[PDB]
Amino acid sequence: TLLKHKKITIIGAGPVGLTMARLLQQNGVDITVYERDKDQDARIFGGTLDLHRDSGQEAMKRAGLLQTYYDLALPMGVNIVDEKGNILTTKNVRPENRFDNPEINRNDLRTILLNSLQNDTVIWDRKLVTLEPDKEKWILTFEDKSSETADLVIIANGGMSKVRKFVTDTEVEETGTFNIQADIHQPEVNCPGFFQLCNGNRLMAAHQGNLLFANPNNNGALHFGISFKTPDEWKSKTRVDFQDRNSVVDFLLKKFSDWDERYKELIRLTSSFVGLATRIFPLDKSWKSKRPLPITMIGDAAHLMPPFAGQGVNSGLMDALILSDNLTNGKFNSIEEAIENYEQQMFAYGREAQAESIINETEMFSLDFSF
Ligand SMILES: Cc1cc2nc3c(=O)[nH]c(=O)nc-3n(C[C@H](O)[C@H](O)[C@H](O)COP(=O)(O)OP(=O)(O)OC[C@H]3O[C@@H](n4cnc5c(N)ncnc54)[C@H](O)[C@@H]3O)c2cc1C
Ligand SMILES: Cc1c2c(c(O)c3c(O)cccc13)C(=O)[C@]1(O)C(=O)C(C(N)=O)=C(O)[C@@H](N(C)C)[C@@H]1C2
């Protein structure tokens, strides 16, 4: 009854925002999602996602999509390999435990979430740029100059969100590591040496402070990521330009001098690199207790954390599960009370996940790390 005659808008059609939309919409709520992506066919860059049984799968199960997720997800083994190509350990998948945390492509996950929403729930090509209160309505202004209204706004537009101020003045901060991600489409044909090395499993390798991760089977593409402590020089004078593939390739081949040629072939065969400093949106400071109208944040917009403990999406899907339940479960007598309890709970499991992810980051990028 809290949401009677309330227009609820979600900013961002990521995994967290769409799951939130599904959880509210299946209860009869009036939901609109504004997404900056041009249209539903836009590719989502990055690796696969694993939904954990305790958190991410609960959100999907609660939304009625758990089996759809299982149908599209792939169980993946993991090989720990040294820099010379020697497999050190092989953690294969139990057929019994294959539904524990199978990997799903990001576009496939988005498609299942979109198909569970009513038609035209997501409004595409809508980049929110301004959010201001007008009496009892939020005013949403978009990059294309259009404007919309809402009674409740849920910020779900990712870790670099610029529309958080009414909730918190906390700024995104850097942790000291750097990630370079890339895709090699049709790896059986285009990087056969490294594809053979993965041998149907995800690959993980650490050497000289440089970590390499690879998934050979991300919907017919090999996705891999290279992570390291950000060089101290890049803070004063950096010489790698990430708009120039050739400069990125040159830098990586220097870093990977001692690695087996199959790794260097992987680097030389990459057409585009995405480089980004690891960031955190810290939960050290409490959010604002005085807000002009109901608003909150979920997902990376709430607790962006380093992606070294596999907590990112699962923490966000927990946000959507707890917040959607609080708004519909009859336990609270105001939207604001329901939001406040959500944030109390989220600061608790959010703070723990961030502390874990920082612990893993510090350990993994020490020169003594060995998996
Ligand atoms: C390199 C890397 C690897 C990772 N690996 C994993 C992993 O293996 N497992 C895992 O669980 N997590 C992983 N994560 C973290 C995980 O991807 C995030 O926690 C998760 O994607 C957060 O989802 P979200 O919906 O909150 O935000 P996002 O996934 O960023 O989605 C936000 C959405 O909002 C849209 N948007 C942004 N600004 C606007 C705007 N102004 N107006 C409208 N729409 C807007 C974006 O286009 C996007 O669709 C990784 C992160 C990184 C950087
Ligand atoms: C360290 C780690 C990683 C991942 C991960 O899921 C995870 C976990 O679930 C528990 C503990 C540790 C990790 C990744 O999935 C992954 O996203 C990944 O597979 C990966 C990749 N396939 O390229 C990465 O790039 C890695 N990172 C730099 C973002 C990260 C590494």
Author numbering: 23 to 393
Q: Mind quoting what the paper says about this structure?
A:
Tet(X6) inactivates all classes of tetracyclines demonstrated by in vitro enzyme assays and phenotypic studies in E. coli. Here, we present structural, biochemical, and phenotypic evidence that anhydrotetracycline binds in a substrate-like orientation and competitively inhibits the type 1 TDase Tet(X6) to rescue tetracycline antibiotic activity as a sacrificial substrate.
An X-ray co-crystal structure of anhydrotetracycline in complex with Tet(X6) was determined at 2.2 Å resolution. A clear non-protein density was observed in the substrate-binding cavity, consistent with the size and shape of anhydrotetracycline. The anhydrotetracycline binds to Tet(X6) in a substrate-like orientation, placing the A-ring close to the FAD and the D-ring close to the C-terminal bridge helix. The carboxamide carbonyl oxygen at the 2-position of anhydrotetracycline forms a hydrogen bond with Arg213. In addition, the Phe224-side chain stabilizes the bound anhydrotetracycline through π-cation interaction with the 7-dimethylamino substitution of anhydrotetracycline. The O4 and N5 atoms of FAD form H-bonds to the keto-enol moiety (O12) and nearby hydroxyl group (O12a) of bound anhydrotetracycline. These interactions contribute to orienting the anhydrotetracycline scaffold for hydroxylation by a putative C4a-peroxy-flavin reactive intermediate at site C11a, with at an appropriate short distance of ~5.6 Å from the C4a of FAD-isoalloxazine heterocycle. The Tet(X6)-anhydrotetracycline complex shows the FAD cofactor bound in an ‘IN’ conformation that is distinct from the ‘OUT’ conformation observed for FAD in X-ray structures of type 2 TDases complexed with anhydrotetracycline.
